[PDB]
Design a protein around this ligand. Structure first.
Ligand SMILES: [Mg+2]
Ligand SMILES: [Mg+2]
Ligand SMILES: [Mg+2]
Ligand SMILES: [Mg+2]
Ligand SMILES: [Mg+2]
Ligand SMILES: [Mg+2]
Ligand SMILES: [Mg+2]
Ligand SMILES: [Mg+2]
Ligand SMILES: [Mg+2]
Ligand SMILES: [Mg+2]
Ligand SMILES: [Mg+2]
Ligand SMILES: [Mg+2]
Length: 74
RNA sequence: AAGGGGACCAGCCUAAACCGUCCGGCUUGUCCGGGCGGGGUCGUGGGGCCCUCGGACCGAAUCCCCAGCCUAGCCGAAG
């Protein structure tokens, strides 16, 4: 069963990663303990859209910095 | 059971795509979710979106009025 990890998990996976676990593990351990969420379409969208926003918010620095770098060094 | 002969006769509304709006969630957005509104309803497949050409007749199973009918009655030939 596919779930999205809200935490890095020892020898399981990394935060934001989509891993495959047994239904029981997810429902009776991972989910209730806030350690993961079901890889449903609705938050696979949410997962992706946050990856996208972060990549955008990163690029805005590397671009804004580089613009600052243009001023300096000259 | 099909088919044939008859009785009756009538076909519609949604869900989803896409759009709008409100509400709240938090993990801040081009986000997810819940309302509601628009859109859409089909098998010669249909619908959405994007271009591109073209801008009155139908009509309820709802509502209103009316006739007609029911719930009392009345006239009615000639020893
Ligand atoms: Mg028959
Ligand atoms: Mg017949
Ligand atoms: Mg008859
Ligand atoms: Mg017919
Ligand atoms: Mg809000
Ligand atoms: Mg939703
Ligand atoms: Mg929405
Ligand atoms: Mg909505
Ligand atoms: Mg088509
Ligand atoms: Mg109707
Ligand atoms: Mg009499
Ligand atoms: Mg008499």
């Amino acid at each position: 069963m596919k779930v999205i990890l809200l935490e890095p998990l020892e020898n399981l996976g990394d935060v934001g990663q989509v891993v495959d676990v047994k239904p029981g593990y997810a429902r009776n351990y991972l989910l209730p303990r806030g350690l993961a969420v079901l890889a449903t379409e609705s938050n696979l969208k949410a997962l992706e859209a946050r990856i996208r926003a972060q990549a955008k918010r990163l690029a805005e620095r590397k671009a804004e910095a580089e613009r600052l770098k243009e001023i300096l060094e000259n």
